[PDB]
Design a protein around this ligand. Sequence first.
Ligand SMILES: *[C@@H]1O[C@H](CO)[C@@H](O[C@@H]2O[C@H](CO)[C@@H](O[C@@H]3O[C@H](CO[C@H]4O[C@H](CO[C@H]5O[C@H](CO)[C@@H](O)[C@H](O)[C@@H]5O)[C@@H](O)[C@H](O[C@H]5O[C@H](CO)[C@@H](O)[C@H](O[C@H]6O[C@H](CO)[C@@H](O)[C@H](O)[C@@H]6O)[C@@H]5O)[C@@H]4O)[C@@H](O)[C@H](O[C@H]4O[C@H](CO)[C@@H](O)[C@H](O)[C@@H]4O[C@H]4O[C@H](CO)[C@@H](O)[C@H](O)[C@@H]4O)[C@@H]3O)[C@H](O)[C@H]2NC(C)=O)[C@H](O)[C@H]1NC(C)=O
Ligand SMILES: *[C@@H]1O[C@H](CO[C@@H]2O[C@@H](C)[C@@H](O)[C@@H](O)[C@@H]2O)[C@@H](O[C@@H]2O[C@H](CO)[C@@H](O[C@@H]3O[C@H](CO[C@H]4O[C@H](CO[C@H]5O[C@H](CO)[C@@H](O)[C@H](O)[C@@H]5O)[C@@H](O)[C@H](O)[C@@H]4O)[C@@H](O)[C@H](O[C@H]4O[C@H](CO)[C@@H](O)[C@H](O)[C@@H]4O[C@@H]4O[C@H](CO)[C@@H](O)[C@H](O)[C@H]4NC(C)=O)[C@@H]3O)[C@H](O)[C@H]2NC(C)=O)[C@H](O)[C@H]1NC(C)=O
Ligand SMILES: *[C@@H]1O[C@H](CO)[C@@H](O[C@@H]2O[C@H](CO)[C@@H](O[C@@H]3O[C@H](CO[C@H]4O[C@H](CO)[C@@H](O)[C@H](O[C@H]5O[C@H](CO[C@H]6O[C@H](CO)[C@@H](O)[C@H](O)[C@@H]6O)[C@@H](O)[C@H](O)[C@@H]5O)[C@@H]4O)[C@@H](O)[C@H](O[C@H]4O[C@H](CO)[C@@H](O)[C@H](O)[C@@H]4O)[C@@H]3O)[C@H](O)[C@H]2NC(C)=O)[C@H](O)[C@H]1NC(C)=O
Ligand SMILES: *[C@@H]1O[C@H](CO)[C@@H](O[C@@H]2O[C@H](CO)[C@@H](O[C@@H]3O[C@H](CO[C@H]4O[C@H](CO)[C@@H](O)[C@H](O)[C@@H]4O)[C@@H](O)[C@H](O)[C@@H]3O)[C@H](O)[C@H]2NC(C)=O)[C@H](O)[C@H]1NC(C)=O
Ligand SMILES: *[C@@H]1O[C@H](CO)[C@@H](O[C@@H]2O[C@H](CO)[C@@H](O[C@@H]3O[C@H](CO)[C@@H](O)[C@H](O)[C@@H]3O)[C@H](O)[C@H]2NC(C)=O)[C@H](O)[C@H]1NC(C)=O
Ligand SMILES: *[C@@H]1O[C@H](CO)[C@@H](O[C@@H]2O[C@H](CO)[C@@H](O[C@@H]3O[C@H](CO)[C@@H](O)[C@H](O)[C@@H]3O)[C@H](O)[C@H]2NC(C)=O)[C@H](O)[C@H]1NC(C)=O
Ligand SMILES: *[C@@H]1O[C@H](CO)[C@@H](O[C@@H]2O[C@H](CO)[C@@H](O[C@@H]3O[C@H](CO)[C@@H](O)[C@H](O)[C@@H]3O)[C@H](O)[C@H]2NC(C)=O)[C@H](O)[C@H]1NC(C)=O
Ligand SMILES: *[C@@H]1O[C@H](CO)[C@@H](O)[C@H](O)[C@H]1NC(C)=O
Lengths: 211, 231, 53, 94
Amino acid sequence: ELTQPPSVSVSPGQTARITCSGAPLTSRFTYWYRQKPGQAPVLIISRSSQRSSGWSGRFSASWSGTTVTLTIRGVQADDEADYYCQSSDTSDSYKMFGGGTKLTVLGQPAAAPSVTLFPPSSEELQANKATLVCLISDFYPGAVTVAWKADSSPVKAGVETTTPSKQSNNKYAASSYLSLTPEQWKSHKSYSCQVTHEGSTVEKTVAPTEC
Amino acid sequence: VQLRESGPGLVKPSETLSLSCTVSQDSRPSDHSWTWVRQSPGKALEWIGDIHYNGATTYNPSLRSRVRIELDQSIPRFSLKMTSMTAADTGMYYCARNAIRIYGVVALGEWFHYGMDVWGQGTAVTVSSASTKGPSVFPLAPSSKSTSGGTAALGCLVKDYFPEPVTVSWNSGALTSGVHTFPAVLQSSGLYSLSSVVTVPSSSLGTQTYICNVNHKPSNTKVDKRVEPKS
Amino acid sequence: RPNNNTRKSIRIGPGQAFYATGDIIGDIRQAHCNVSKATWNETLGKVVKQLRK
Amino acid sequence: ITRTELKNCSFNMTTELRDKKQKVYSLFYRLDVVQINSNKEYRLINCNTSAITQACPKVSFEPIPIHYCAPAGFAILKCKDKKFNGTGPCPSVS
Ligand SMILES: *[C@@H]1O[C@H](CO)[C@@H](O[C@@H]2O[C@H](CO)[C@@H](O[C@@H]3O[C@H](CO[C@H]4O[C@H](CO[C@H]5O[C@H](CO)[C@@H](O)[C@H](O)[C@@H]5O)[C@@H](O)[C@H](O[C@H]5O[C@H](CO)[C@@H](O)[C@H](O[C@H]6O[C@H](CO)[C@@H](O)[C@H](O)[C@@H]6O)[C@@H]5O)[C@@H]4O)[C@@H](O)[C@H](O[C@H]4O[C@H](CO)[C@@H](O)[C@H](O)[C@@H]4O[C@H]4O[C@H](CO)[C@@H](O)[C@H](O)[C@@H]4O)[C@@H]3O)[C@H](O)[C@H]2NC(C)=O)[C@H](O)[C@H]1NC(C)=O
Ligand SMILES: *[C@@H]1O[C@H](CO[C@@H]2O[C@@H](C)[C@@H](O)[C@@H](O)[C@@H]2O)[C@@H](O[C@@H]2O[C@H](CO)[C@@H](O[C@@H]3O[C@H](CO[C@H]4O[C@H](CO[C@H]5O[C@H](CO)[C@@H](O)[C@H](O)[C@@H]5O)[C@@H](O)[C@H](O)[C@@H]4O)[C@@H](O)[C@H](O[C@H]4O[C@H](CO)[C@@H](O)[C@H](O)[C@@H]4O[C@@H]4O[C@H](CO)[C@@H](O)[C@H](O)[C@H]4NC(C)=O)[C@@H]3O)[C@H](O)[C@H]2NC(C)=O)[C@H](O)[C@H]1NC(C)=O
Ligand SMILES: *[C@@H]1O[C@H](CO)[C@@H](O[C@@H]2O[C@H](CO)[C@@H](O[C@@H]3O[C@H](CO[C@H]4O[C@H](CO)[C@@H](O)[C@H](O[C@H]5O[C@H](CO[C@H]6O[C@H](CO)[C@@H](O)[C@H](O)[C@@H]6O)[C@@H](O)[C@H](O)[C@@H]5O)[C@@H]4O)[C@@H](O)[C@H](O[C@H]4O[C@H](CO)[C@@H](O)[C@H](O)[C@@H]4O)[C@@H]3O)[C@H](O)[C@H]2NC(C)=O)[C@H](O)[C@H]1NC(C)=O
Ligand SMILES: *[C@@H]1O[C@H](CO)[C@@H](O[C@@H]2O[C@H](CO)[C@@H](O[C@@H]3O[C@H](CO[C@H]4O[C@H](CO)[C@@H](O)[C@H](O)[C@@H]4O)[C@@H](O)[C@H](O)[C@@H]3O)[C@H](O)[C@H]2NC(C)=O)[C@H](O)[C@H]1NC(C)=O
Ligand SMILES: *[C@@H]1O[C@H](CO)[C@@H](O[C@@H]2O[C@H](CO)[C@@H](O[C@@H]3O[C@H](CO)[C@@H](O)[C@H](O)[C@@H]3O)[C@H](O)[C@H]2NC(C)=O)[C@H](O)[C@H]1NC(C)=O
Ligand SMILES: *[C@@H]1O[C@H](CO)[C@@H](O[C@@H]2O[C@H](CO)[C@@H](O[C@@H]3O[C@H](CO)[C@@H](O)[C@H](O)[C@@H]3O)[C@H](O)[C@H]2NC(C)=O)[C@H](O)[C@H]1NC(C)=O
Ligand SMILES: *[C@@H]1O[C@H](CO)[C@@H](O[C@@H]2O[C@H](CO)[C@@H](O[C@@H]3O[C@H](CO)[C@@H](O)[C@H](O)[C@@H]3O)[C@H](O)[C@H]2NC(C)=O)[C@H](O)[C@H]1NC(C)=O
Ligand SMILES: *[C@@H]1O[C@H](CO)[C@@H](O)[C@H](O)[C@H]1NC(C)=O
């Protein structure tokens, strides 16, 4: 029943502090690792002798009664992901897992997405049903509405908007997907899907029979 | 050194699932003890047990009834099993190696753990009784203005797929300068709809308009489609 | 014994010096004695044979 | 901070001058020391029972062949019989 925090943050270019509390902290040592989203974790710190293992400059570790101290380098920039924590029971049988903290760096730029909104063109107008598309990405952070409209004023119409997910450099790229009939694609309006976060918010148009 | 997974990666809740991993070009695979881990959809990592060429059996006590691991002394095959328990826990299962160095004499307690140091390609496993109809090609039809470079969005989307894995390749992995892929949602049927637009240096394109290659892992996994020369 | 020890001489009284262990360099390990497993199984067999009669 | 078998122990002894004392940290082995009654304070096991005298460093403890030869007017009879069960009448004598 070890305890690793899951939500802490710190400013870039400053020393941080990672802990992991658990009673079976004797014959266990400490794991951590930083799994960037959708990737595989790597060695946070590795034992190459029975004495110690904080030789590399980037990271060091300290030991307390129960909580473990994962000190880190002075610069906390560019390297960010959630840091788990793992250890083994006293009987040298079992490996406990107990979460780990996702860290975010301050001083992040101001949110602004600018992707070109694609139209449903060239395959479904041949088929039975229209496949509606208005993919918006590269926002930071989320909590942005796309505001689907009827002609010049919004209407939800029950369309589906998916979940934000970080990719590349800590930038969520959820996207948004519409789903309706083809008769509506050529009976409703020319259609154009904007985005709204704060202040200046831009859009692009899909256009009808544009070829 | 190299190590990559194997197996289907999908199952119904009633039947036992069994996947494996393959290690090769390793200088010494026999002595190193390895264990498997799983990552829930709520992003909570978990531990399954160690095993050794020695023949040591150990797993997580919460999953003892389900898992029963096997070994191949000839060529390293890393089979795995999970019987009674299947649903909910379904997420991204991994392949890893729990490296071991020695501080002296084995069988004397002198074999300290190096820890996890090499991992697999990464595979995903979820439970859902629905099967896969498969993906069909679907271009996005771009439009370009006159001159001086500028914006260049061109996509080849696929609306229908059931396997969480999606393999994206623009001209069989020819362009790595810019590549982009995004996820989607379940809709009402449960077949998600993943589409990908690639940012390319487009001003005037001649017979280099780039194609798309599909995942489609559960079904026949090969459709090659070219976007229209609209540039 | 795998221990790599060091002579630490400390003068007690006028001339005498007490030679003790310093800090052990190059890891710490347990002492052991190996025995040929195949060669021992034949010796325990020859003994039980002549104890038999 | 985590088998043990040995102790990084210390004490203070006599120095070259009986007026002055000196602390030195040495090491000892388990079972050479047994507890007295925080901060562990130990004790040489021999001080409870008998004295102690360090062996000389230049003394070789390797066993070498030491013949036992008889004085004058006496002789050591050795048995040459291979199967000398117990002790009885050895027929082959030297
Ligand atoms: C009674 O029975 C017992 C039991 O059988 C016998 O007792 C002892 O048993 C011990 C435990 O088995 C054993 O102790 C260790 O021996 C290790 C030997 O390791 C061998 O394999 C290594 C493989 O690792 C590499 O490949 C891996 C994949 O294959 C890869 O994953 C890994 O990353 C590595 O790349 C080899 O590296 C290692 O090489 C040795 O032997 C080679 C033979 O070809 C030789 O070529 C090597 O060096 C040569 O060249 C160099 C450079 O010029 C010269 O300097 C050398 O003199 C030599 O010519 C090398 O000798 C083996 O094949 C040891 O590795 C291990 O030592 C490490 O750990 C100890 C304790 O922690 C350290 O003190 C030590 O310095 C080593 O690691 C430290 O340094 C490294 C280097 O940076 C650090 O990374 C690390 O963090 C540490 O700080 C142990 O010594 C005993 O050897 C064994 N006894 C004997 C005498 O052999 C007992 O002998 C029996 N008794 C009798 C009398 O019968
Ligand atoms: C087995 O046990 C033995 C015996 O250790 C015993 O207990 C320890 C606590 C110590 O008091 C021993 O004297 C005692 O016998 C172990 O052998 C000792 O191990 C310790 C481990 O810490 C060693 O301690 C380090 O000593 C470093 C150097 O100090 C030496 O010289 C001192 C006077 O010299 C002055 O000038 C020199 C430069 O010329 C400076 O380098 C030095 O700092 C002095 O200013 C003398 O008083 C000492 O006894 C010793 O002979 C010292 O630099 C280290 O202290 C630093 O760094 C540590 C981490 O490495 C850190 O933990 C300390 O807190 C400390 O940080 C600060 O450093 C400042 C420097 O000025 C100092 O002012 C602050 O006070 C200090 N912070 C505070 C507060 O603590 C260590 O103290 C010791 O040298 C070993 N024996 C010797 C040779 O004396 C043996 O290791 C054990 N086994 C094993 C293998 O572990
Ligand atoms: C007198 O002789 C009799 C002869 O019968 C002895 O009786 C048996 O003798 C055999 C002789 O080899 C013994 O040895 C072997 O036993 C294993 C099973 O042992 C497992 O359980 C024991 C406790 O009983 C435990 O000590 C072992 O530990 C091994 O594995 C652990 C696992 O750790 C791993 O996972 C953990 C996580 O859980 C990680 O943290 C860790 O890093 C690692 O990854 C290791 O840590 C240990 O170092 C050790 O390796 C085991 O858990 C059998 O499996 C052996 O034989 C079988 O396989 C071989 C190989 O294929 C095959 O040839 C053979 O036919 C078997 O199928 C072997 O039997 C028995 O323990 C012993 N006891 C029994 C059950 O009767 C008697 O003990 C002797 N008396 C004395 C005093 O020595
Ligand atoms: C230091 O002075 C001591 C007191 O004069 C010496 O006496 C004892 O010596 C033994 C030798 O092994 C030490 O080891 C302990 O022995 C006790 C004996 O208890 C046994 O009998 C009782 C009933 O009479 C029974 O209940 C127990 O189960 C035992 O069968 C053990 O109980 C301990 O576990 C341990 O083995 C003693 O520590 C030591 N002290 C005493 C008062 O027993 C000692 O020999 C002198 N020096 C040393 C330490 O060797
Ligand atoms: C037992 O411990 C002793 C002392 O540590 C070991 O002796 C050391 O062996 C090394 C082998 O390379 C010697 O070489 C080099 O010395 C230079 C200069 O001091 C140093 O910078 C290198 O890192 C390296 O140590 C070393 O001089 C020698 N003595 C010392 C003072 O360390 C010995 O090797 C160990 N066990 C045995 C018997 O091999
Ligand atoms: C020989 O070593 C012993 C210890 O085995 C010395 O006795 C006293 O040991 C304590 C242990 O903590 C020393 O600690 C000091 O305590 C004072 C007051 O509580 C504190 O202010 C210091 O910071 C330190 O913690 C103490 O110095 C030492 N002596 C006294 C007067 O208590 C003994 O002194 C050593 N040599 C001999 C036999 O004189
Ligand atoms: C070596 O082998 C000889 C035989 O060549 C043994 O001599 C005989 O040993 C047996 C058993 O020890 C004796 O029988 C017993 O004698 C005891 C009295 O000593 C008696 O209490 C028992 O009821 C039983 O009769 C036997 O008398 C003895 N002598 C002869 C002539 O057979 C000898 O013991 C073996 N051990 C040695 C000496 O290494
Ligand atoms: C002892 O060491 C020698 C060194 O050549 C080795 O040949 C022999 O097998 C060893 N015996 C054992 C079992 O310790």
